[PDB]
Amino acid sequence: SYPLEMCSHFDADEIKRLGKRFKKLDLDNSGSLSVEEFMSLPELQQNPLVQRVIDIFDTDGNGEVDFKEFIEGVSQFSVKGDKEQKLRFAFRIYDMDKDGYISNGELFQVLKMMVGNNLKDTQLQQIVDKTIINADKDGDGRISFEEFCAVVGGLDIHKKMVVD
Amino acid sequence: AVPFPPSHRLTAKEVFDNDGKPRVDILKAHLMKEGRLEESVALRIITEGASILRQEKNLLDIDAPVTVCGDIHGQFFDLMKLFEVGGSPANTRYLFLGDYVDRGYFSIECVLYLWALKILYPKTLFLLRGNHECRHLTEYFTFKQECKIKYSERVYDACMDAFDCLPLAALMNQQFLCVHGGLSPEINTLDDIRKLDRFKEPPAYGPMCDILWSDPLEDFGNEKTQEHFTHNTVRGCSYFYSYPAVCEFLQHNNLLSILRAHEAQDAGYRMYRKSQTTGFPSLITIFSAPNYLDVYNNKAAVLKYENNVMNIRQFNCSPHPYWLPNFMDVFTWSLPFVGEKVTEMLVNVLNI
Amino acid sequence: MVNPTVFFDIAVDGEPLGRVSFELFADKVPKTAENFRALSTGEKGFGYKGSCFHRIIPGFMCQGGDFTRHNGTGGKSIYGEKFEDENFILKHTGPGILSMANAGPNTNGSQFFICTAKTEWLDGKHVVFGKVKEGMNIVEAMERFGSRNGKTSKKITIADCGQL
Amino acid sequence: XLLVTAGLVLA
Ligand SMILES: [Ca+2]
Ligand SMILES: [Ca+2]
Ligand SMILES: [Ca+2]
Ligand SMILES: [Ca+2]
């Protein structure tokens, strides 16, 4: 009992199919996806961005992705998604504490997970610095979703963040 | 713990003293924290020194005691050391054989500083023209884009006009022909060079292109033929001169040796075959860019010709601030990586 | 066994430029070698045929092998997402040496570069596994469509490829 | 610089 409310681009059929994959991933059948359950896929153990996505899919910060969260997060990539929505998702890969601003420490932390050790921390930090300096058009020492948009707009990476 | 670049852009007053003289110790310090000078400030320096350059002869005449330098290629912090090694230019006669831009990512800094120092000591410090002092190469390489990131397209233009005033060569202590590239099938006497019109983008052929672009034969000194010039398949232009070509120009011109940069040397220099007449190296190459491109692991070197002693000073690379390719910003940089891995994750998650 | 000889029929914008063969050193790094062999044939279902060289830096090397994303972010081995670093027995000694591109240690996918110079700073970091047996002149020709940022001006394609 | 990476091209 009790309908489940959720905002998404999918029709009833697509909500059912994804409803099945969610059950298969739901190891302990608890109605919510855990990281160990996410990491159950081998292709995902070799991905530095899994935890970022998951914390982005996790809207109510309880460490699990329930069905509403899973659907609505898989929806950001729906081919039907606009341009802004796909940047927004990208913007979120950087804003860790979800305050709507990418910080100097946050930009460093995220980047490091991806670059790892092919860059001394000193090197990564410098370019993080230099990146925020030219992009901080308001001088608040951090990047806004707008400033972010001003630097990555014509890259068109949102066209790649599409799944079926 | 990582020093952070200085937001304040130097002023005319902070750069030039009341007599109009450049305050080089001030300048030099700002530049090492990666700082910049207000556009005009820079443009002034760039234009003041080019006037001094347009006034100088195609072939300079420089008297020992002198310190000769090779390519610098934007490695600003390897320049700061070349100066600690070659001695204060307040009390030392210099001569850079060219290539101060492109390759390294601090090409403008080098330029601004070397230009400011040409102003301050116009009768001691001498700069020549290198292959990289020209539109066609700075467009392909990162100087142009560099200029636009740090400054503007105007500054880049200021420089391009300047470079056209760079002396094509120098006759050092009446014994050496100091060039960047090499000889020309068309340049037989020191007089020929004097007749050339140098104020232009180097031609895609001819004596000026050859001055700047000629290279000695890979087997220079032991070539199997007494042939002089053969087209440079390495540069794709100009020529590969030979040991005979050189000794014929040297003798005819009563010169001792040729001193050029242009090619990278693991030791930061290279002495070529000794002239049968003199027993001195007919040709000398000198590279002043240590650990070129950050991976060559090559030593750098200046040449010090004093008290009838040509002493080769070698130095190693020094530390410099990181910079992604084409002065890219970390978002442009990682967004493709991000947009692929997240795509990748969902794709495995939905194919569950 | 014997060392396999593959080939690539390169094409510039569709127009055939010529063929490039390679001697694979399975006698040293048999696994990596195989990986390149199988992707040349297509015999595992997915391969080099039709792919391009997205990054060509003149006087340095020709990087290719991304048959999934076509920009340097993708590609996969016959063995899965990627496979370990076999060994660094062979070193980059000069033009024609084939080796694997990667994103750190143990990340060999399907990308590789044909050297056009002696790149020793790569020794110990990237896996050398093959060499251009014939057609070096064709590789030199591909260099012309390159730039110092890797980007090409004409699409350099692997029109056809296989084993000899 | 002169490196051959797949994802995060370096200097
Ligand atoms: Ca569960
Ligand atoms: Ca949740
Ligand atoms: Ca934040
Ligand atoms: Ca800001």
Pairing of strands A143-144, C55-57: unpaired
Verify whether the Cβ–Cβ distance B340 to C73 is below 8 Å: yes
**Residue B131 is assigned to a ligand binding site:** yes
Please name which of C91, C93, C128, C90 lies closest in space to residue C108, comparing C-alpha atoms: C128
- List gaps in chain A by the residue before each (C–N > 2.5 Å): none
- Chain B residues in contact with A79 (beta carbon < 8 A): none
End-to-end alpha carbon distance in chain A: 29
Return d(Cα C22, Cα C9) in angstroms, integer: 12
Q: List CB contacts of A90: < 8 A, sequence separation 6 or more.
A: A152, A157, A158, A161, B335, B338, B339
Q: List CB contacts of B150: < 8 A, sequence separation 6 or more.
A: B36, B108
Residues C37 and C24 sit within 8 Å (Cβ to Cβ): yes
Return d(Cα B268, Cα B273) in angstroms, integer: 17
Please name which of B287, B92, B283 lies closest in space to residue B176, comparing C-alpha atoms: B283
The H or E element that residue A44 is part of is: none
Which residue in B8, B30, B132, B252 is the catalytic one? B132
- Chain A residues in contact with D7 (beta carbon < 8 A): 114
Phi, psi of B129 (to 5 degrees): -105, 130
Tell me how long chain D is: 11
List the Cα angle B319/B321/B327 in 5-degree steps: 140
Q: List CB contacts of B217: < 8 A, sequence separation 6 or more.
A: B223, B230, B240, B241, B242, B243
Tell me how long chain B is: 352
CB count, 10 Å around CB of C147?
14
Return d(Cα D2, Cα B297) in angstroms, integer: 13
CA atoms within 13 A on the CB side of A2: 0
* Cis, peptide link before residue B122, omega less than 30° from 0: no
List the Cα angle A160/D10/A97 in 5-degree steps: 60
Return d(Cα C57, Cα C143) in angstroms, integer: 7
Q: How far is the CA of B180 from the CAs of B100, B169, C27, C77, in angstroms? A: 12, 8, 46, 48
Q: Give chain B's domain count.
A: 1
* SS3 state at A104: helix
Is A117 at the interface with chain C, CB within 8 A? yes
Nearest CA distance, B350 vs chain D (angstrom)? 23
Range list of β-strands (E), chain A: 32-33, 65-66, 101-102, 143-144
Q: How far is the CA of C12 from the CAs of B91, C152, C153, in angstroms? A: 57, 10, 10
For the CA atoms of B144, B147, B149, B152, what is the dihedral angle to 10 degrees? -110
The alpha carbon of A146 and the centre of ligand 4 are apart by a number of angstroms equal to 9
**Residue B252 is assigned to a ligand binding site:** no
Q: List CB contacts of A148: < 8 A, sequence separation 6 or more.
A: A87, A91, A94, A102, A135, B331
Q: Could you tell me the two tokens for A53? A: 């996505």
Residue C134, domain CATH: 2.40.100.10
Return d(Cα C90, Cα B212) in angstroms, integer: 38
Q: Which residue has the tokens 């694979």?
A: C24
**Domain that includes residue B300, residue range:** 1-352
Please name which of B1, B5, B4, B25 lies closest in space to residue B15, comparing C-alpha atoms: B25
**Domain that includes residue A18, residue range:** 1-164
Distance of CA B67 to the CA centre of its chain: 15
Which residues are A16's β-sheet partners?
none
Strand order in the sheet with B215-216: B215-216, B239-241, B230-231
Which chain B residues in 319-338 lie under 8 Å from chain C, judged by CB atoms? 325-326, 336-337
Using a CB cutoff of 5 Å, list residues around ligand 4, an ion.
Answer: A 136, 138, 140
CB count, 10 Å around CB of A16?
10
Please name which of C161, C164, C163, C160 lies closest in space to residue C14, comparing C-alpha atoms: C160
Is C149 at the interface with chain B, CB within 8 A? yes
Tell me, what amino acid is at C138?
A: I
Tell me which ligand sits closest to the C-alpha of residue A32: 1
Is A39 at the interface with chain B, CB within 8 A? no
Residue of chain B with shortest Cα separation from C118: B296
Return d(Cα A158, Cα A155) in angstroms, integer: 8
**Residue B180 is assigned to a ligand binding site:** yes
Return d(Cα C139, Cα C118) in angstroms, integer: 15
Return d(Cα A60, Cα A75) in angstroms, integer: 17
**Residue B157 is assigned to a ligand binding site:** no
SS (H, E, C) chain B: CCCCCCCCCECHHHHECCCCCECHHHHHHHHCCCCCECHHHHHHHHHHHHHHHHHCCCEEEECCCEEEECCCCCCHHHHHHHHHHHCCCCCCEEEECCCCCCCCCCHHHHHHHHHHHHHHCCCCCCECCCCCCCHHHHHHCCHHHHHHHHCCHHHHHHHHHHHCCCCCEEEECCCEEECCCCCECCECCHHHHHHCCCCCCCCCCCHHHHHHHCEECCCCCCCCCCCCCEECCCCCCCEEECHHHHHHHHHHCCCCEEEECCCCCCCCEEECCECCCCCCECEEEECCCCCHHHCCCCCEEEEEEECCEEEEEEECCCCCCCCCHHHCCHHHHHHHHHHHHHHHHHHHHHCC
Return d(Cα B309, Cα B74) in angstroms, integer: 29
Active site residues of C: 55, 60, 63, 102, 113, 122, 126
Using a CB cutoff of 5 Å, list residues around ligand 3, an ion.
Answer: A 95, 97, 99, 106
CB count, 10 Å around CB of B96?
28
List the Cα angle B214/B218/B219 in 5-degree steps: 120
Q: How far is the CA of C150 from the CAs of A28, A141, C62, in angstroms? A: 49, 33, 9
Pairing of strands C112-115, B300-306: unpaired
Return d(Cα B295, Cα D1) in angstroms, integer: 7
Tell me, what amino acid is at C66?
A: D
* SS3 state at C161: strand
Tell me, what amino acid is at C120?
A: E
Q: Could you tell me the two tokens for B314? A: 């070698």
- Chain A residues in contact with B332 (beta carbon < 8 A): 151-152, 155
Q: Which residue has the tokens 């350099």?
A: C156
Name every residue in B having a CB less than 8 A away from some CB of A. 2, 4-5, 149, 321-324, 329-332, 334-350, 352
Residue B163, domain CATH: 3.60.21.10
Q: How far is the CA of B142 from the CAs of A56, B118, C117, C142, D11, in angstroms? A: 38, 24, 21, 22, 12
Is A116 at the interface with chain C, CB within 8 A? yes
The alpha carbon of A2 and the centre of ligand 1 are apart by a number of angstroms equal to 20
Distance of CA B238 to the CA centre of its chain: 19
Return d(Cα A53, Cα A94) in angstroms, integer: 11
The alpha carbon of A135 and the centre of ligand 4 are apart by a number of angstroms equal to 7
Verify whether the Cβ–Cβ distance B335 to A74 is below 8 Å: no
Phi, psi of A63 (to 5 degrees): 75, 10
Is C121 at the interface with chain B, CB within 8 A? yes
- The technique by which this structure was obtained is X-ray
Q: Could you tell me the two tokens for A140? A: 């608040």
Q: Could you tell me the two tokens for B352? A: 């569950």
Pairing of strands B257-260, B176-178: parallel
Phi, psi of B3 (to 5 degrees): -55, 145
Q: Could you tell me the two tokens for B265? A: 């040397």
Return d(Cα C76, Cα C46) in angstroms, integer: 9
The alpha carbon of A70 and the centre of ligand 1 are apart by a number of angstroms equal to 12
Q: Give chain A's domain count.
A: 1
CA atoms within 13 A on the CB side of B283: 27
Q: Give chain C's domain count.
A: 1
Please name which of B169, B162, B166, B256 lies closest in space to residue B210, comparing C-alpha atoms: B169
Q: How far is the CA of B236 from the CAs of A91, B221, B258, B265, C117, in angstroms? A: 46, 22, 23, 20, 16
- Chain A residues in contact with D10 (beta carbon < 8 A): 118-119
Q: How many CB pairs under 8 A join A and C?
A: 7
Nearest CA distance, A46 vs chain D (angstrom)? 14
**Residue B99 is assigned to a ligand binding site:** yes
Name the residue facing A160 among B2, B331, B339 (closest C-beta): B339
Residues C127 and C108 sit within 8 Å (Cβ to Cβ): yes
Which chain A residues in 43-102 lie under 8 Å from chain B, judged by CB atoms? 43-44, 47-50, 52-53, 74, 77, 89-90, 93-94
Residues C161 and C48 sit within 8 Å (Cβ to Cβ): yes
Q: Could you tell me the two tokens for B224? A: 């199997």
**Domain that includes residue C91, residue range:** 1-164
Resolution (A): 3.1
CB count, 10 Å around CB of A96?
17
